[PDB]
Amino acid sequence: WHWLQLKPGQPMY
Amino acid sequence: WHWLQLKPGQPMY
Amino acid sequence: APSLSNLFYDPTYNPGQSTINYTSIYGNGSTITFDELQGLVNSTVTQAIMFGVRCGAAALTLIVMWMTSRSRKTPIFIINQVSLFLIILHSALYFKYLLSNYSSVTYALTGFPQFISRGDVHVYGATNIIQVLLVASIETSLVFQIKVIFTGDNFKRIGLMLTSISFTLGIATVTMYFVSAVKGMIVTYNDVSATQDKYFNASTILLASSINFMSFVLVVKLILAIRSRRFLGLKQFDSFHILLIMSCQSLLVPSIIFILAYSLKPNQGTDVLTTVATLLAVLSLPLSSMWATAANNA
Amino acid sequence: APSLSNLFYDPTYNPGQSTINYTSIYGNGSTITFDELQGLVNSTVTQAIMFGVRCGAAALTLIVMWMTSRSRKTPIFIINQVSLFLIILHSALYFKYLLSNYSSVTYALTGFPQFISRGDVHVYGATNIIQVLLVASIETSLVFQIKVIFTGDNFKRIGLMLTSISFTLGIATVTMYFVSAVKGMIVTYNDVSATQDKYFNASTILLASSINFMSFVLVVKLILAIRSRRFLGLKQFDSFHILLIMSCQSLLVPSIIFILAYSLKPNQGTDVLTTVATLLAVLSLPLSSMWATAANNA
Ligand SMILES: CC(C)CCC[C@@H](C)[C@H]1CC[C@H]2[C@@H]3CC=C4C[C@@H](OC(=O)CCC(=O)O)CC[C@]4(C)[C@H]3CC[C@]12C
Ligand SMILES: CC(C)CCC[C@@H](C)[C@H]1CC[C@H]2[C@@H]3CC=C4C[C@@H](OC(=O)CCC(=O)O)CC[C@]4(C)[C@H]3CC[C@]12C
Ligand SMILES: CC(C)CCC[C@@H](C)[C@H]1CC[C@H]2[C@@H]3CC=C4C[C@@H](OC(=O)CCC(=O)O)CC[C@]4(C)[C@H]3CC[C@]12C
Ligand SMILES: CC(C)CCC[C@@H](C)[C@H]1CC[C@H]2[C@@H]3CC=C4C[C@@H](OC(=O)CCC(=O)O)CC[C@]4(C)[C@H]3CC[C@]12C
Ligand SMILES: CC(C)CCC[C@@H](C)[C@H]1CC[C@H]2[C@@H]3CC=C4C[C@@H](OC(=O)CCC(=O)O)CC[C@]4(C)[C@H]3CC[C@]12C
Ligand SMILES: CC(C)CCC[C@@H](C)[C@H]1CC[C@H]2[C@@H]3CC=C4C[C@@H](OC(=O)CCC(=O)O)CC[C@]4(C)[C@H]3CC[C@]12C
Ligand SMILES: CC(C)CCC[C@@H](C)[C@H]1CC[C@H]2[C@@H]3CC=C4C[C@@H](OC(=O)CCC(=O)O)CC[C@]4(C)[C@H]3CC[C@]12C
Ligand SMILES: CC(C)CCC[C@@H](C)[C@H]1CC[C@H]2[C@@H]3CC=C4C[C@@H](OC(=O)CCC(=O)O)CC[C@]4(C)[C@H]3CC[C@]12C
Ligand SMILES: CC(C)CCC[C@@H](C)[C@H]1CC[C@H]2[C@@H]3CC=C4C[C@@H](OC(=O)CCC(=O)O)CC[C@]4(C)[C@H]3CC[C@]12C
Ligand SMILES: CC(C)CCC[C@@H](C)[C@H]1CC[C@H]2[C@@H]3CC=C4C[C@@H](OC(=O)CCC(=O)O)CC[C@]4(C)[C@H]3CC[C@]12C
Ligand SMILES: CC(C)CCC[C@@H](C)[C@H]1CC[C@H]2[C@@H]3CC=C4C[C@@H](OC(=O)CCC(=O)O)CC[C@]4(C)[C@H]3CC[C@]12C
Ligand SMILES: CC(C)CCC[C@@H](C)[C@H]1CC[C@H]2[C@@H]3CC=C4C[C@@H](OC(=O)CCC(=O)O)CC[C@]4(C)[C@H]3CC[C@]12C
Ligand SMILES: *[C@@H]1O[C@H](CO)[C@@H](O)[C@H](O)[C@H]1NC(C)=O
Ligand SMILES: *[C@@H]1O[C@H](CO)[C@@H](O)[C@H](O)[C@H]1NC(C)=O
Ligand SMILES: *[C@@H]1O[C@H](CO)[C@@H](O)[C@H](O)[C@H]1NC(C)=O
Ligand SMILES: *[C@@H]1O[C@H](CO)[C@@H](O)[C@H](O)[C@H]1NC(C)=O
């Protein structure tokens, strides 16, 4: 499994 | 006004 | 990143005017700006949100209609239901198209047919056939709405006239979407890089005509209702006609939206409005069909 | 197109392995394949369809809920309603983000802060605050569901225990999404190129825990119901429990979907499953809340 990743300006789902 | 345009493989809306 | 450059400190670079030295069929040198690439990507991101909206809209109107229906088995119920199921299936295969090798940035910039593979042309054909299995649903919903609208107590001259003209127009449009689809096929299989949009465009005009006709009809019915109820009715419709005009009981909103569709930017990736007319029509079929299946006088 | 090249006839080019000699902060030479660009674009096209689906889903569940509600003014109705309205507003501002200058292909490939402009950071902050105004809706829907579930005739020991633990967990998660949001702010404004995802991730774990807890609770209630109705009930539930297990009356499906979310590809542009859990939970709140607001024994 993997951690979720955010782009440098992606707000929360 | 303008005619609608289709990309070379865009099916109908 | 061994080291940066002074260009990063330049506050006035404004990327969007820079260059991409990509490779095309026309050669190994073809400059294009980031702005054009971002517009090509924003056309896909702009035409994906609308079909996600359509898929979710039809999926959650299908369940509601299914569970809430007081009376089932009538033809119009199954007709609108299968119309929304073809909406969901069209949206599914159009999502497949959007992530497929025809909308990819590669084919757009680089006109290389070698990227294309057979089977994707079968998905293109299938989508063009599903659009016809959707318009057929709409038109066999509209003739089976007029047949309930004008019948029985009403005169058989205006009613038969209206049903005849709407049936003729509808069968004519369905034969148009089809010949359009087949002609597009015979090309996309003959040569992947070709296109055929004229008959598609005339079909869209004719469907707009179909829904404008139905809306004109239901407002004519509203005028007739108000006239009759004024002659000797029970005080007519007291503040109840405020909805009917433009609250999706009638087909006025799609009639406006199709017309405003052509008055947009010259295809800046946004052909949304014509994608909005069909959704709003198929979603408003229950309201107009339960507006038409009414006494209209008492 | 003065002339083509022999490369166009090569049937085995397979574009996707070619090169883009673009310009970045690291220099004026930075090769990247078309495949990586197409994957970056497919992440946007893949994360747009889900939020179009969410916007249409919430929009067409809002109208249905509004018009079909037999009994209004109860707190849970307004709570689920405002939850779906924050879903629509979040989807709207996330569409703004997707077409904004942060998801653009330029910033992804070219890490140039000069493309970024102030106000877009205000939209990023606003979206991160709207996520908290949505989770607050969910959690003040879940404590106001447990408070109806366990109360009255039922024992005040298990009920008070369950309400206390769920309220504590929920206030704790809301304080987590917030500190997460503020920390992300203090960075995105301090430096646009930075990120802070750890607290977001732990908040997502804790929300998954909240919904798993609620589902565990409602299946415990189902066991208790079956046990009581077996003692001296009216033949128990005859073939009526087939739905309850996994037909969205309970919160089992989101409990599975959150867990399967982490077992996907290592972020190949598809973080959909965790975007599916929240939609399915907020859309299933009416069913579980009308499951919990029931006699449960007679
Ligand atoms: C993920 C799936 C389950 C769809 C999620 C969308 C939900 C918000 C939908 C799906 C089924 C809907 C329900 C289907 C049927 C009804 C009955 C309806 O009551 C009626 O007037 C008809 C039935 C009757 O006469 O009692 C009130 C709305 C309600 C509860 C609907 C509320 C909205 C629901 C829960
Ligand atoms: C309407 C509701 C109930 C949803 C059902 C929609 C279906 C009609 C969709 C869902 C999944 C789709 C399939 C997903 C995957 C593929 C593989 C795809 O493979 C190819 O030939 C292209 C790629 C390749 O060359 O490998 C062809 C279309 C197909 C069968 C799709 C056909 C249309 C399907 C069955
Ligand atoms: C009525 C509502 C509840 C929908 C019920 C049917 C679903 C199970 C369907 C609707 C849309 C379908 C999706 C539409 C499109 C695709 C892309 C399709 O893509 C491919 O096969 C190849 C391209 C790619 O990798 O995306 C894979 C299946 C999938 C996710 C489908 C999976 C099945 C879905 C979710
Ligand atoms: C103005 C823009 C921003 C759009 C707003 C959303 C519309 C799509 C909503 C707003 C008011 C809604 C209407 C409000 C009330 C009704 C009556 C409702 O009637 C019944 O179902 C039974 C009779 C009754 O409820 O009184 C049918 C849907 C309809 C026309 C609704 C259809 C959807 C409408 C037009
Ligand atoms: C019940 C339903 C019918 C309500 C929705 C009504 C639609 C017809 C509206 C809602 C959002 C509108 C869109 C919102 C924003 C824009 C961007 C706008 O862009 C510009 O004018 C250029 C850029 C700029 O504004 O500087 C063009 C119209 C458009 C597509 C609008 C077209 C009309 C839309 C689709
Ligand atoms: C509860 C009711 C409203 C039904 C909700 C169904 C949705 C959860 C479905 C409808 C369309 C589906 C999407 C259709 C197609 C795809 C593409 C599919 O393939 C890829 O994106 C991978 C390949 C690539 O990156 O190009 C991944 C799942 C996804 C986003 C699907 C995710 C699930 C979605 C949003
Ligand atoms: C029946 C229920 C589901 C309500 C239907 C609402 C739709 C009419 C909304 C929902 C999502 C909206 C879209 C969300 C985002 C965009 C992108 C937006 O950006 C552009 O392409 C224009 C950019 C610019 O020039 O400013 C144009 C409008 C559009 C297609 C919107 C058009 C109106 C849509 C389809
Ligand atoms: C362009 C707009 C109209 C699209 C928005 C979605 C529509 C498909 C929705 C909006 C309002 C909905 C209506 C709101 C309320 C009702 C009443 C509902 O009946 C009851 O509440 C009582 C049922 C019983 O007593 O058994 C039946 C569905 C219906 C007509 C709904 C059918 C679906 C409608 C037209
Ligand atoms: C139930 C009903 C009443 C809800 C109707 C809500 C719509 C009117 C909302 C939902 C999504 C919104 C859109 C979401 C995102 C955008 C992008 C936003 O930014 C741009 O288009 C300019 C910047 C760029 O080009 O990226 C402009 C408004 C717009 C089209 C919004 C217009 C209003 C929309 C269509
Ligand atoms: C669902 C219903 C309640 C409708 C929701 C509509 C919102 C999504 C609209 C209302 C006001 C809109 C905003 C009004 C003005 C702007 C400025 C506009 O221009 C810029 O910020 C770019 C230039 C600059 O940076 O100064 C970008 C979109 C934005 C934030 C809009 C984004 C979409 C918003 C929040
Ligand atoms: C992804 C593919 C496999 C489609 C999935 C469809 C489900 C989302 C459907 C199938 C059965 C449906 C359920 C069938 C019956 C009901 C009972 C209904 O309420 C009633 O008991 C009264 C109904 C009435 O009499 O009108 C509320 C919706 C619900 C839970 C439905 C919710 C949506 C469900 C789970
Ligand atoms: C009752 C209803 C609401 C249940 C809905 C179930 C969904 C959670 C399912 C239906 C279709 C499923 C999708 C079907 C296909 C795929 C593609 C799969 O990836 C591949 O097959 C290849 C991906 C690649 O090549 O990049 C990853 C899971 C995913 C997105 C699935 C995720 C889970 C989805 C959205
Ligand atoms: C791209 O091609 C042009 C000539 O067509 C050349 O001047 C330039 O140096 C090449 N590289 C870039 C980044 O433009
Ligand atoms: C492009 O093609 C021509 C002839 O095939 C060749 O002479 C030239 O070196 C190539 N240039 C690049 C940048 O590949
Ligand atoms: C791009 O840069 C490389 C050197 O880094 C060079 O070999 C090549 O000719 C340039 N053009 C293309 C299309 O790769
Ligand atoms: C890249 O930058 C260096 C130094 O600024 C310069 O010498 C070189 O000519 C540039 N190359 C290209 C393709 O722009």
Author numbering:
A (entry chain I), B (entry chain K): 1 to 13
C (entry chain B), D (entry chain A): 5 to 302
Structure paper excerpt:
However, during processing of the Ste2–Ag dataset, two different conformations of Ste2 were found, and therefore two separate structures were determined. By contrast, in the Ste2IL–Ag state (similar to the inactive Ste2–Ant state; the superscript denotes ‘inactive-like’ (IL)), densities for both the N-terminal and C terminal sections are visible in all maps along the principal components, supporting a stronger engagement of Trp1 to cause the shift of the extracellular region of H6 and the rotamer change of Tyr2666x58; by contrast, density in the middle of the peptide was weaker, presumably owing to its flexibility. The cryo-EM density for Ste2IL–Ag and Ste2AL–Ag shows lower resolution in H5–H7 than observed in Ste2–Ant and Ste2–Ag–G, resulting in only a proportion of the side chains being modelled, which highlights their dynamic role in the conformational change. On the extracellular face of the receptor, Ste2IL–Ag has a conformation part way between that of Ste2–Ant and Ste2–Ag–G. This conformation exhibits the agonist-induced displacement of H6 by 5.3 Å (measured at the Cα of Ser2676x59), although this is 0.4 Å short of its position in Ste2–Ag–G, and the reorientation of ECL3. However, there is no significant displacement of the extracellular end of H7 as observed in Ste2–Ag–G and neither are major changes on the intracellular face that are necessary for G protein coupling. These additional structural changes occur in the transition from Ste2IL–Ag to Ste2AL–Ag. Agonist binding to the ligand-free inactive state of Ste2 causes reorientation of the extracellular end of H5 to facilitate ligand binding, an outward movement of the extracellular end of H6 and a shift of ECL3 (Ste2IL–Ag state), resulting in a contraction of the orthosteric binding site by an average of 27%.
Ste2 is a homodimer that can couple to two G proteins simultaneously and its dimer interface is formed by the N terminus, extracellular loop 1 (ECL1) and transmembrane helices H1 and H7. Activation of Ste2 requires both the removal of a blockage from the G protein coupling site (H7) and formation of the binding site primarily through the inward movement of H6.
